[PDB]
Amino acid sequence: KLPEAYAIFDPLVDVLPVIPVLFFALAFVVQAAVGF
């Protein structure tokens, strides 16, 4: 429940928090592409 005019975005608001984590994740993807 965000202000009425934002109704459209509950979907994203929903995900935004996962991102932080996502970074430690990516950090690996790159390290892998760069053969350690």
């Binding site: 509950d10 979907p11 929903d14 995900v15 991102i19 996502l22 994740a25 990516l26 993807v29 592409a33």
Partner: peptide, 28 residues
């Protein structure tokens, strides 16, 4: 409802930078 599809894109946003970087060059 939709929430899932829109999460998908952001998630594959990061490995895509790795890809767009593979092809072009730099970083190294």
């Amino acid at each position: 409802i939709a929430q899932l599809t829109m999460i998908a894109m952001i998630g594959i946003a990061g490995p895509m930078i790795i890809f767009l970087l593979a092809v072009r060059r730099g970083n190294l």
